Amino acid sequence: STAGKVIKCKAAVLWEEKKPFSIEEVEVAPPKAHEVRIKMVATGICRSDDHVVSGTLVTPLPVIAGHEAAGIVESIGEGVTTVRPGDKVIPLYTPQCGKCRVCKHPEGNFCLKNDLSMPRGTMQDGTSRFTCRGKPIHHFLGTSTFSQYTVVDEISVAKIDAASPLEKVCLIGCGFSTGYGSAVKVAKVTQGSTCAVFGLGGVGLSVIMGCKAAGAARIIGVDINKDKFAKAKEVGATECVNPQDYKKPIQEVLTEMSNGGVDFSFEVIGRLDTMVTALSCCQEAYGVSVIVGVPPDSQNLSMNPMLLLSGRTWKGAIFGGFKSKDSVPKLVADFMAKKFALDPLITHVLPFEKINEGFDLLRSGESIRTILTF
Amino acid sequence: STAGKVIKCKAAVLWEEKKPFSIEEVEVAPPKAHEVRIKMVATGICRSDDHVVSGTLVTPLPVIAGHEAAGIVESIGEGVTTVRPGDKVIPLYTPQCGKCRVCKHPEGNFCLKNDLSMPRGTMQDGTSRFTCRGKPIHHFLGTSTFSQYTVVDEISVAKIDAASPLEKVCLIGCGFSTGYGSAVKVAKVTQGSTCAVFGLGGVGLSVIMGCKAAGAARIIGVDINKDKFAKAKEVGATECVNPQDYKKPIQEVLTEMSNGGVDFSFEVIGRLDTMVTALSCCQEAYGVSVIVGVPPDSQNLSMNPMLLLSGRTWKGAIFGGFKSKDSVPKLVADFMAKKFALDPLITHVLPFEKINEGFDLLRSGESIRTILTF
Ligand SMILES: NC(=O)C1=CN([C@@H]2O[C@H](COP(=O)(O)OP(=O)(O)OC[C@H]3O[C@@H](n4cnc5c(N)ncnc54)[C@H](O)[C@@H]3O)[C@@H](O)[C@H]2O)C=CC1
Ligand SMILES: NC(=O)C1=CN([C@@H]2O[C@H](COP(=O)(O)OP(=O)(O)OC[C@H]3O[C@@H](n4cnc5c(N)ncnc54)[C@H](O)[C@@H]3O)[C@@H](O)[C@H]2O)C=CC1
Ligand SMILES: O=CNC1CCCCC1
Ligand SMILES: O=CNC1CCCCC1
Ligand SMILES: [Zn+2]
Ligand SMILES: [Zn+2]
Ligand SMILES: [Zn+2]
Ligand SMILES: [Zn+2]
């Protein structure tokens, strides 16, 4: 009934930076070979989407943003073998082509087909499937989930359990998996260790969940918004500290609290200064610090390399280090078996048409994750 | 005829920066409780010693430098249990107290009793055993090996094989162990991998030795002095490149040669720009870069944190990550079992009285390691 045809539907178009999204009609082309067109069911509001609005994260405009979502396949293009119409699916903003040197590496997950390093805002073939007012619109990280329908390349979608609650497991498309994996896969937090988590939004709360799952003895949450502390403690923090409360830099405070520095630290905000602070507060000889937050475009941090020469390890990761298409269905299955919880992250629910109120909630500090329903 | 008495002997005193060493008589006090007085037999000239002369490395002056050495115990103070008069020993510029959180950690080696982070230039008790022309002289990293006799704390000395050739195994006191361990212990180079080594002096050649022992398939040496390339290939480099030969930045050159970035890179020079270059030339999703070189005092580097967010790991280490008193006797035993070679590092052997000529050889680019014999 819609297969092979252009679909007219509503989407949230961003025409320029620092402006509200425009809810209006777009035209969605049918999928070409090895492409999948998806009817969206739920999408979360992640800070990275707000980074597109603010210019923190540069990608070509005008654009349909959104990358944390779940939906149901409407149709598939020629040659698609891994999903079928009617399947529940999660779009993958980090693809898994399975053929490049990173996909073949046992640890790597930043597939070389990604649209992050040199953003084009297109499908893999360099073209767009979206038109609005007769104008071509860019894609975002090959997903573009702020739309009733999107088209993604096959390497950018994973089939998930047919009984999955899509208004919850959309968070496995970004925020939960990023935070959880950053702790259990990237840092490899050890039982009995002391952890420090900078930033207690959706992703930082998920880092805390991973630290707790790994058996950390102490998990210190750090945020300048003390309203975030209650939920952080609910999901596993053993203390929370507000840097604004202290007359000393918080790296000094955390070093004292940990009797010489923490075992594992995580930057989950997106500021150059807290990236250096988080590295400094881990123990100088054997500490590990993981960058998760997204820095402002093209800006360099400044740091003393003696912080590394003493023995520290510094690393970062996209999507918690998970190979995306392998890991997303397994994470959904684990959620179905109650191995981790997603309800603590969901503070607000709104219809898709109220997307701008959802971003207002994020910017005011009141929300963790708002889930939008189509 | 010297136990319990002050010893008058020859040492090389550095009275101020950017001056030749002054070879003259000093007074060496007898060892106090848990101290060891050593008759030096051989000491190598390491670039870190030259860093003290040049002001790159700040430590209190005037000083008896030298930290890469081997000798024979002349006497021990009360309470010493790990060495005896007559023992062959190697001083440890990174102590191993066995009691701090770092010594008890399975990975850490930067013992909290070190004199590197906040240099005092004294014994552990805060005083000096050296006098010259009436004046107290500072120690260097708890070793001070540019002297016919030195006094060290028990936690800064290791007993080694009584049959050890000290004119060779003095290099296990710094240069060899640092480079070798940086490859095999800190980076954990894997079989079949591609490595890039920036800097082909004594430490860089030992990094190559470790990469080869770990089974690397490709080892690219990088140096602006092409005279270093012959020896680098002899000990395992498969290719050598001189950045001055290229119009493009060498991180771009190395990324092309490795078809997308190397598995492991090592900065073994001590320049801020080459630490950032070495990080950039390793593969963005799974590469590992190790800082070995000593940066100029109090200078910060500048880098883009997206280099880490994509998946790179950045780390540094002192003394190759080796727990010093545990590892040095085992490395000596490994050398005696012919498991690695030290002669490729030794280009010059001079009497101690020619220390300044040995430093001229290093600064001119002509030497790798000069061994000074007492
Ligand atoms: N590496 C990856 O793959 C991913 C990176 N991100 C990035 O992670 C970061 C966090 O994302 P969300 O949790 O959704 O954002 P969020 O905005 O909900 O949480 C950020 C938290 O940091 C706090 N904060 C802000 N400035 C602070 C400061 N100077 N000191 C201490 N705390 C401060 C805020 O009060 C807030 O609670 C963002 O930068 C996001 O773009 C998000 C998902 C994937
Ligand atoms: N982390 C640790 O525990 C230790 C650190 N070090 C430091 O390692 C570094 C190397 O030590 P050595 O091998 O003894 O010194 P070295 O002076 O013999 O070797 C340094 C090499 O770097 C080359 N080089 C200089 N500038 C260069 C540039 N822009 N690009 C490419 N190559 C360049 C030089 O030609 C030279 O061959 C020093 O900074 C030393 O202080 C030394 C031992 C222990
Ligand atoms: O939040 C989802 N994706 C992010 C990952 C880090 C770079 C910016 C985009
Ligand atoms: O070369 C020997 N020791 C070095 C170790 C790194 C800091 C300067 C001193
Ligand atoms: Zn996200
Ligand atoms: Zn791939
Ligand atoms: Zn040295
Ligand atoms: Zn110790």
PDB file of N, CA, C and O in Angstrom, chain A residues 101-102 105 110 258-261 283 285-286 291-293 299-305 308-318, chain B residues 101-102 105 110 258-261 283 286 291-293 295 299-305 308-318:
ATOM      1  N   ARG A 101      38.302  -2.747   8.432  1.00  0.00           N
ATOM      2  CA  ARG A 101      39.321  -3.210   9.370  1.00  0.00           C
ATOM      3  C   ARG A 101      38.870  -3.036  10.814  1.00  0.00           C
ATOM      4  O   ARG A 101      39.270  -3.817  11.687  1.00  0.00           O
ATOM      5  N   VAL A 102      38.037  -2.032  11.083  1.00  0.00           N
ATOM      6  CA  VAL A 102      37.550  -1.827  12.441  1.00  0.00           C
ATOM      7  C   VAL A 102      36.524  -2.890  12.797  1.00  0.00           C
ATOM      8  O   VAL A 102      36.560  -3.465  13.889  1.00  0.00           O
ATOM      9  N   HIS A 105      38.210  -6.040  13.682  1.00  0.00           N
ATOM     10  CA  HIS A 105      39.065  -5.987  14.863  1.00  0.00           C
ATOM     11  C   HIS A 105      38.279  -6.432  16.096  1.00  0.00           C
ATOM     12  O   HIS A 105      37.116  -6.055  16.252  1.00  0.00           O
ATOM     13  N   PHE A 110      34.082   1.634  15.896  1.00  0.00           N
ATOM     14  CA  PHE A 110      33.857   2.858  15.119  1.00  0.00           C
ATOM     15  C   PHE A 110      34.043   2.543  13.638  1.00  0.00           C
ATOM     16  O   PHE A 110      35.061   2.864  13.016  1.00  0.00           O
ATOM     17  N   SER A 258      39.259   9.684  47.718  1.00  0.00           N
ATOM     18  CA  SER A 258      39.658   8.346  47.312  1.00  0.00           C
ATOM     19  C   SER A 258      41.011   7.951  47.876  1.00  0.00           C
ATOM     20  O   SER A 258      41.596   6.969  47.408  1.00  0.00           O
ATOM     21  N   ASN A 259      41.524   8.702  48.853  1.00  0.00           N
ATOM     22  CA  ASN A 259      42.815   8.414  49.481  1.00  0.00           C
ATOM     23  C   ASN A 259      43.916   8.222  48.437  1.00  0.00           C
ATOM     24  O   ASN A 259      44.743   7.309  48.528  1.00  0.00           O
ATOM     25  N   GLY A 260      43.914   9.093  47.425  1.00  0.00           N
ATOM     26  CA  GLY A 260      45.009   9.153  46.473  1.00  0.00           C
ATOM     27  C   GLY A 260      44.627   9.125  45.003  1.00  0.00           C
ATOM     28  O   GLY A 260      45.514   9.067  44.146  1.00  0.00           O
ATOM     29  N   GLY A 261      43.330   9.174  44.690  1.00  0.00           N
ATOM     30  CA  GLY A 261      42.867   9.101  43.313  1.00  0.00           C
ATOM     31  C   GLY A 261      41.964   7.907  43.063  1.00  0.00           C
ATOM     32  O   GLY A 261      42.112   6.874  43.723  1.00  0.00           O
ATOM     33  N   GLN A 283      43.917   7.820  39.773  1.00  0.00           N
ATOM     34  CA  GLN A 283      45.203   7.593  40.415  1.00  0.00           C
ATOM     35  C   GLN A 283      46.340   7.657  39.391  1.00  0.00           C
ATOM     36  O   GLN A 283      46.247   7.105  38.292  1.00  0.00           O
ATOM     37  N   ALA A 285      49.294   6.462  38.892  1.00  0.00           N
ATOM     38  CA  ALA A 285      50.098   5.334  38.434  1.00  0.00           C
ATOM     39  C   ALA A 285      49.293   4.268  37.704  1.00  0.00           C
ATOM     40  O   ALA A 285      49.824   3.614  36.799  1.00  0.00           O
ATOM     41  N   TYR A 286      48.023   4.076  38.065  1.00  0.00           N
ATOM     42  CA  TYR A 286      47.242   2.986  37.491  1.00  0.00           C
ATOM     43  C   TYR A 286      45.800   3.372  37.184  1.00  0.00           C
ATOM     44  O   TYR A 286      45.016   2.496  36.790  1.00  0.00           O
ATOM     45  N   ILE A 291      36.672   9.346  28.261  1.00  0.00           N
ATOM     46  CA  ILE A 291      35.889  10.481  27.767  1.00  0.00           C
ATOM     47  C   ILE A 291      34.656   9.943  27.054  1.00  0.00           C
ATOM     48  O   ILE A 291      34.775   9.146  26.116  1.00  0.00           O
ATOM     49  N   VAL A 292      33.479  10.396  27.484  1.00  0.00           N
ATOM     50  CA  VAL A 292      32.218  10.081  26.827  1.00  0.00           C
ATOM     51  C   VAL A 292      31.560  11.323  26.233  1.00  0.00           C
ATOM     52  O   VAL A 292      30.970  11.259  25.152  1.00  0.00           O
ATOM     53  N   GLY A 293      31.676  12.465  26.905  1.00  0.00           N
ATOM     54  CA  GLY A 293      31.012  13.673  26.434  1.00  0.00           C
ATOM     55  C   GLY A 293      31.590  14.191  25.127  1.00  0.00           C
ATOM     56  O   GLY A 293      32.753  13.963  24.793  1.00  0.00           O
ATOM     57  N   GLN A 299      37.566  22.410  18.906  1.00  0.00           N
ATOM     58  CA  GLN A 299      38.312  23.011  20.007  1.00  0.00           C
ATOM     59  C   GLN A 299      39.284  22.009  20.621  1.00  0.00           C
ATOM     60  O   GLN A 299      38.959  20.829  20.787  1.00  0.00           O
ATOM     61  N   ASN A 300      40.466  22.497  20.967  1.00  0.00           N
ATOM     62  CA  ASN A 300      41.521  21.698  21.570  1.00  0.00           C
ATOM     63  C   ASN A 300      41.569  21.937  23.071  1.00  0.00           C
ATOM     64  O   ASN A 300      41.391  23.069  23.535  1.00  0.00           O
ATOM     65  N   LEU A 301      41.815  20.870  23.828  1.00  0.00           N
ATOM     66  CA  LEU A 301      42.110  21.019  25.244  1.00  0.00           C
ATOM     67  C   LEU A 301      43.610  21.200  25.448  1.00  0.00           C
ATOM     68  O   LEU A 301      44.425  20.943  24.559  1.00  0.00           O
ATOM     69  N   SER A 302      43.971  21.634  26.652  1.00  0.00           N
ATOM     70  CA  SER A 302      45.363  21.807  27.042  1.00  0.00           C
ATOM     71  C   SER A 302      45.625  20.971  28.286  1.00  0.00           C
ATOM     72  O   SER A 302      44.817  20.968  29.220  1.00  0.00           O
ATOM     73  N   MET A 303      46.739  20.247  28.292  1.00  0.00           N
ATOM     74  CA  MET A 303      47.044  19.360  29.405  1.00  0.00           C
ATOM     75  C   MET A 303      48.538  19.082  29.501  1.00  0.00           C
ATOM     76  O   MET A 303      49.280  19.178  28.522  1.00  0.00           O
ATOM     77  N   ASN A 304      48.954  18.737  30.719  1.00  0.00           N
ATOM     78  CA  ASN A 304      50.349  18.421  31.011  1.00  0.00           C
ATOM     79  C   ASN A 304      50.576  16.925  30.825  1.00  0.00           C
ATOM     80  O   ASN A 304      49.970  16.126  31.551  1.00  0.00           O
ATOM     81  N   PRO A 305      51.423  16.504  29.878  1.00  0.00           N
ATOM     82  CA  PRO A 305      51.597  15.062  29.623  1.00  0.00           C
ATOM     83  C   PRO A 305      52.228  14.291  30.774  1.00  0.00           C
ATOM     84  O   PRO A 305      52.216  13.054  30.738  1.00  0.00           O
ATOM     85  N   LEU A 308      50.064  11.627  32.111  1.00  0.00           N
ATOM     86  CA  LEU A 308      50.104  10.318  31.482  1.00  0.00           C
ATOM     87  C   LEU A 308      51.404   9.578  31.780  1.00  0.00           C
ATOM     88  O   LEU A 308      51.390   8.359  31.970  1.00  0.00           O
ATOM     89  N   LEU A 309      52.535  10.291  31.822  1.00  0.00           N
ATOM     90  CA  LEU A 309      53.824   9.622  32.001  1.00  0.00           C
ATOM     91  C   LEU A 309      53.906   8.864  33.324  1.00  0.00           C
ATOM     92  O   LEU A 309      54.616   7.857  33.415  1.00  0.00           O
ATOM     93  N   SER A 310      53.193   9.319  34.355  1.00  0.00           N
ATOM     94  CA  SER A 310      53.218   8.613  35.631  1.00  0.00           C
ATOM     95  C   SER A 310      52.539   7.249  35.557  1.00  0.00           C
ATOM     96  O   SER A 310      52.814   6.393  36.402  1.00  0.00           O
ATOM     97  N   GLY A 311      51.659   7.029  34.578  1.00  0.00           N
ATOM     98  CA  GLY A 311      51.057   5.722  34.397  1.00  0.00           C
ATOM     99  C   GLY A 311      49.580   5.714  34.037  1.00  0.00           C
ATOM    100  O   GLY A 311      49.028   4.643  33.762  1.00  0.00           O
ATOM    101  N   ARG A 312      48.930   6.881  34.017  1.00  0.00           N
ATOM    102  CA  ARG A 312      47.501   6.930  33.708  1.00  0.00           C
ATOM    103  C   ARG A 312      47.206   6.450  32.290  1.00  0.00           C
ATOM    104  O   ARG A 312      48.025   6.570  31.372  1.00  0.00           O
ATOM    105  N   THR A 313      45.998   5.919  32.121  1.00  0.00           N
ATOM    106  CA  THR A 313      45.443   5.545  30.827  1.00  0.00           C
ATOM    107  C   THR A 313      44.278   6.477  30.508  1.00  0.00           C
ATOM    108  O   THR A 313      43.401   6.684  31.354  1.00  0.00           O
ATOM    109  N   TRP A 314      44.256   7.015  29.287  1.00  0.00           N
ATOM    110  CA  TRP A 314      43.207   7.929  28.839  1.00  0.00           C
ATOM    111  C   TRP A 314      42.621   7.392  27.544  1.00  0.00           C
ATOM    112  O   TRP A 314      43.364   7.107  26.604  1.00  0.00           O
ATOM    113  N   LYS A 315      41.298   7.258  27.480  1.00  0.00           N
ATOM    114  CA  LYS A 315      40.689   6.767  26.255  1.00  0.00           C
ATOM    115  C   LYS A 315      39.301   7.373  26.112  1.00  0.00           C
ATOM    116  O   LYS A 315      38.785   8.013  27.028  1.00  0.00           O
ATOM    117  N   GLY A 316      38.718   7.208  24.923  1.00  0.00           N
ATOM    118  CA  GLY A 316      37.336   7.585  24.680  1.00  0.00           C
ATOM    119  C   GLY A 316      36.646   6.503  23.870  1.00  0.00           C
ATOM    120  O   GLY A 316      37.274   5.511  23.483  1.00  0.00           O
ATOM    121  N   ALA A 317      35.341   6.683  23.649  1.00  0.00           N
ATOM    122  CA  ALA A 317      34.611   5.691  22.871  1.00  0.00           C
ATOM    123  C   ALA A 317      33.317   6.281  22.341  1.00  0.00           C
ATOM    124  O   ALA A 317      32.740   7.189  22.943  1.00  0.00           O
ATOM    125  N   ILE A 318      32.856   5.724  21.225  1.00  0.00           N
ATOM    126  CA  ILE A 318      31.537   6.005  20.670  1.00  0.00           C
ATOM    127  C   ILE A 318      30.636   4.832  21.023  1.00  0.00           C
ATOM    128  O   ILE A 318      31.044   3.673  20.896  1.00  0.00           O
TER     129      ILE A 318
ATOM    130  N   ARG B 101      49.902   1.928  48.179  1.00  0.00           N
ATOM    131  CA  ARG B 101      48.808   1.409  47.358  1.00  0.00           C
ATOM    132  C   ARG B 101      49.277   1.068  45.948  1.00  0.00           C
ATOM    133  O   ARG B 101      48.742   0.144  45.322  1.00  0.00           O
ATOM    134  N   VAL B 102      50.266   1.796  45.432  1.00  0.00           N
ATOM    135  CA  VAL B 102      50.771   1.513  44.091  1.00  0.00           C
ATOM    136  C   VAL B 102      51.568   0.214  44.078  1.00  0.00           C
ATOM    137  O   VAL B 102      51.379  -0.631  43.198  1.00  0.00           O
ATOM    138  N   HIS B 105      49.257  -2.667  44.086  1.00  0.00           N
ATOM    139  CA  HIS B 105      48.402  -2.802  42.912  1.00  0.00           C
ATOM    140  C   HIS B 105      49.089  -3.679  41.865  1.00  0.00           C
ATOM    141  O   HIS B 105      50.280  -3.503  41.600  1.00  0.00           O
ATOM    142  N   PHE B 110      54.708   3.080  39.856  1.00  0.00           N
ATOM    143  CA  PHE B 110      55.197   4.404  40.240  1.00  0.00           C
ATOM    144  C   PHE B 110      55.003   4.570  41.749  1.00  0.00           C
ATOM    145  O   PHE B 110      54.112   5.267  42.231  1.00  0.00           O
ATOM    146  N   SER B 258      50.303   2.684   6.820  1.00  0.00           N
ATOM    147  CA  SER B 258      49.657   1.631   7.592  1.00  0.00           C
ATOM    148  C   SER B 258      48.240   1.352   7.115  1.00  0.00           C
ATOM    149  O   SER B 258      47.497   0.647   7.805  1.00  0.00           O
ATOM    150  N   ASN B 259      47.853   1.894   5.957  1.00  0.00           N
ATOM    151  CA  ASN B 259      46.510   1.722   5.405  1.00  0.00           C
ATOM    152  C   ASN B 259      45.435   2.051   6.440  1.00  0.00           C
ATOM    153  O   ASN B 259      44.462   1.316   6.621  1.00  0.00           O
ATOM    154  N   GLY B 260      45.631   3.171   7.135  1.00  0.00           N
ATOM    155  CA  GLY B 260      44.600   3.691   8.013  1.00  0.00           C
ATOM    156  C   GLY B 260      45.007   3.953   9.451  1.00  0.00           C
ATOM    157  O   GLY B 260      44.149   4.312  10.266  1.00  0.00           O
ATOM    158  N   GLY B 261      46.294   3.799   9.779  1.00  0.00           N
ATOM    159  CA  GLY B 261      46.769   4.017  11.136  1.00  0.00           C
ATOM    160  C   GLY B 261      47.435   2.783  11.714  1.00  0.00           C
ATOM    161  O   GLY B 261      47.065   1.660  11.360  1.00  0.00           O
ATOM    162  N   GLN B 283      45.632   4.037  14.815  1.00  0.00           N
ATOM    163  CA  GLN B 283      44.292   3.893  14.249  1.00  0.00           C
ATOM    164  C   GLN B 283      43.233   4.472  15.186  1.00  0.00           C
ATOM    165  O   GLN B 283      43.253   4.234  16.395  1.00  0.00           O
ATOM    166  N   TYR B 286      40.946   1.798  17.430  1.00  0.00           N
ATOM    167  CA  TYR B 286      41.504   0.790  18.323  1.00  0.00           C
ATOM    168  C   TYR B 286      42.996   0.966  18.569  1.00  0.00           C
ATOM    169  O   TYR B 286      43.601   0.117  19.241  1.00  0.00           O
ATOM    170  N   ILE B 291      53.369   7.317  25.655  1.00  0.00           N
ATOM    171  CA  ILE B 291      54.362   8.375  25.838  1.00  0.00           C
ATOM    172  C   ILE B 291      55.480   7.829  26.718  1.00  0.00           C
ATOM    173  O   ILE B 291      55.228   7.371  27.839  1.00  0.00           O
ATOM    174  N   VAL B 292      56.712   7.873  26.210  1.00  0.00           N
ATOM    175  CA  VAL B 292      57.899   7.534  26.981  1.00  0.00           C
ATOM    176  C   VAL B 292      58.791   8.750  27.206  1.00  0.00           C
ATOM    177  O   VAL B 292      59.387   8.894  28.275  1.00  0.00           O
ATOM    178  N   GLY B 293      58.896   9.632  26.215  1.00  0.00           N
ATOM    179  CA  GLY B 293      59.775  10.782  26.332  1.00  0.00           C
ATOM    180  C   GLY B 293      59.346  11.766  27.408  1.00  0.00           C
ATOM    181  O   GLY B 293      58.163  11.920  27.726  1.00  0.00           O
ATOM    182  N   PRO B 295      58.757  15.424  28.785  1.00  0.00           N
ATOM    183  CA  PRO B 295      58.457  16.747  28.213  1.00  0.00           C
ATOM    184  C   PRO B 295      59.227  17.845  28.924  1.00  0.00           C
ATOM    185  O   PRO B 295      59.664  17.663  30.070  1.00  0.00           O
ATOM    186  N   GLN B 299      55.324  22.529  30.671  1.00  0.00           N
ATOM    187  CA  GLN B 299      54.703  22.871  29.397  1.00  0.00           C
ATOM    188  C   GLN B 299      53.543  21.929  29.104  1.00  0.00           C
ATOM    189  O   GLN B 299      53.678  20.709  29.251  1.00  0.00           O
ATOM    190  N   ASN B 300      52.420  22.494  28.678  1.00  0.00           N
ATOM    191  CA  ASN B 300      51.231  21.743  28.307  1.00  0.00           C
ATOM    192  C   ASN B 300      51.195  21.514  26.801  1.00  0.00           C
ATOM    193  O   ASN B 300      51.603  22.376  26.018  1.00  0.00           O
ATOM    194  N   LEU B 301      50.682  20.355  26.397  1.00  0.00           N
ATOM    195  CA  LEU B 301      50.376  20.134  24.993  1.00  0.00           C
ATOM    196  C   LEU B 301      48.932  20.546  24.718  1.00  0.00           C
ATOM    197  O   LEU B 301      48.144  20.795  25.632  1.00  0.00           O
ATOM    198  N   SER B 302      48.594  20.607  23.431  1.00  0.00           N
ATOM    199  CA  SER B 302      47.255  20.944  22.971  1.00  0.00           C
ATOM    200  C   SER B 302      46.803  19.866  22.000  1.00  0.00           C
ATOM    201  O   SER B 302      47.551  19.497  21.087  1.00  0.00           O
ATOM    202  N   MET B 303      45.596  19.343  22.205  1.00  0.00           N
ATOM    203  CA  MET B 303      45.123  18.291  21.323  1.00  0.00           C
ATOM    204  C   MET B 303      43.609  18.355  21.225  1.00  0.00           C
ATOM    205  O   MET B 303      42.926  18.893  22.103  1.00  0.00           O
ATOM    206  N   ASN B 304      43.093  17.741  20.165  1.00  0.00           N
ATOM    207  CA  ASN B 304      41.651  17.648  19.957  1.00  0.00           C
ATOM    208  C   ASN B 304      41.132  16.363  20.596  1.00  0.00           C
ATOM    209  O   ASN B 304      41.548  15.270  20.183  1.00  0.00           O
ATOM    210  N   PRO B 305      40.233  16.434  21.586  1.00  0.00           N
ATOM    211  CA  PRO B 305      39.757  15.202  22.245  1.00  0.00           C
ATOM    212  C   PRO B 305      38.962  14.252  21.351  1.00  0.00           C
ATOM    213  O   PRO B 305      38.745  13.105  21.773  1.00  0.00           O
ATOM    214  N   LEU B 308      40.576  10.899  20.915  1.00  0.00           N
ATOM    215  CA  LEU B 308      40.268   9.866  21.893  1.00  0.00           C
ATOM    216  C   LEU B 308      38.827   9.378  21.797  1.00  0.00           C
ATOM    217  O   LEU B 308      38.573   8.184  21.957  1.00  0.00           O
ATOM    218  N   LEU B 309      37.870  10.272  21.534  1.00  0.00           N
ATOM    219  CA  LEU B 309      36.470   9.843  21.526  1.00  0.00           C
ATOM    220  C   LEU B 309      36.209   8.751  20.492  1.00  0.00           C
ATOM    221  O   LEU B 309      35.347   7.888  20.712  1.00  0.00           O
ATOM    222  N   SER B 310      36.938   8.758  19.369  1.00  0.00           N
ATOM    223  CA  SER B 310      36.754   7.725  18.355  1.00  0.00           C
ATOM    224  C   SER B 310      37.186   6.343  18.831  1.00  0.00           C
ATOM    225  O   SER B 310      36.745   5.342  18.253  1.00  0.00           O
ATOM    226  N   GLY B 311      38.029   6.256  19.862  1.00  0.00           N
ATOM    227  CA  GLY B 311      38.391   4.963  20.408  1.00  0.00           C
ATOM    228  C   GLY B 311      39.853   4.779  20.771  1.00  0.00           C
ATOM    229  O   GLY B 311      40.203   3.740  21.333  1.00  0.00           O
ATOM    230  N   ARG B 312      40.711   5.754  20.476  1.00  0.00           N
ATOM    231  CA  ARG B 312      42.131   5.599  20.792  1.00  0.00           C
ATOM    232  C   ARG B 312      42.356   5.505  22.296  1.00  0.00           C
ATOM    233  O   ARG B 312      41.576   6.024  23.104  1.00  0.00           O
ATOM    234  N   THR B 313      43.446   4.833  22.658  1.00  0.00           N
ATOM    235  CA  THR B 313      43.952   4.744  24.023  1.00  0.00           C
ATOM    236  C   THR B 313      45.292   5.466  24.085  1.00  0.00           C
ATOM    237  O   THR B 313      46.166   5.219  23.247  1.00  0.00           O
ATOM    238  N   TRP B 314      45.453   6.342  25.077  1.00  0.00           N
ATOM    239  CA  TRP B 314      46.677   7.110  25.283  1.00  0.00           C
ATOM    240  C   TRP B 314      47.182   6.834  26.691  1.00  0.00           C
ATOM    241  O   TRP B 314      46.418   6.938  27.651  1.00  0.00           O
ATOM    242  N   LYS B 315      48.450   6.456  26.822  1.00  0.00           N
ATOM    243  CA  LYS B 315      48.988   6.206  28.149  1.00  0.00           C
ATOM    244  C   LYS B 315      50.470   6.560  28.167  1.00  0.00           C
ATOM    245  O   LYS B 315      51.087   6.789  27.130  1.00  0.00           O
ATOM    246  N   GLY B 316      51.020   6.659  29.379  1.00  0.00           N
ATOM    247  CA  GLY B 316      52.448   6.816  29.559  1.00  0.00           C
ATOM    248  C   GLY B 316      52.926   5.906  30.677  1.00  0.00           C
ATOM    249  O   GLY B 316      52.125   5.254  31.354  1.00  0.00           O
ATOM    250  N   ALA B 317      54.246   5.850  30.852  1.00  0.00           N
ATOM    251  CA  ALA B 317      54.783   5.004  31.914  1.00  0.00           C
ATOM    252  C   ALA B 317      56.191   5.447  32.280  1.00  0.00           C
ATOM    253  O   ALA B 317      56.918   6.004  31.451  1.00  0.00           O
ATOM    254  N   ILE B 318      56.556   5.184  33.538  1.00  0.00           N
ATOM    255  CA  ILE B 318      57.919   5.324  34.041  1.00  0.00           C
ATOM    256  C   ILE B 318      58.553   3.942  34.072  1.00  0.00           C
ATOM    257  O   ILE B 318      57.914   2.975  34.497  1.00  0.00           O
TER     258      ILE B 318
END
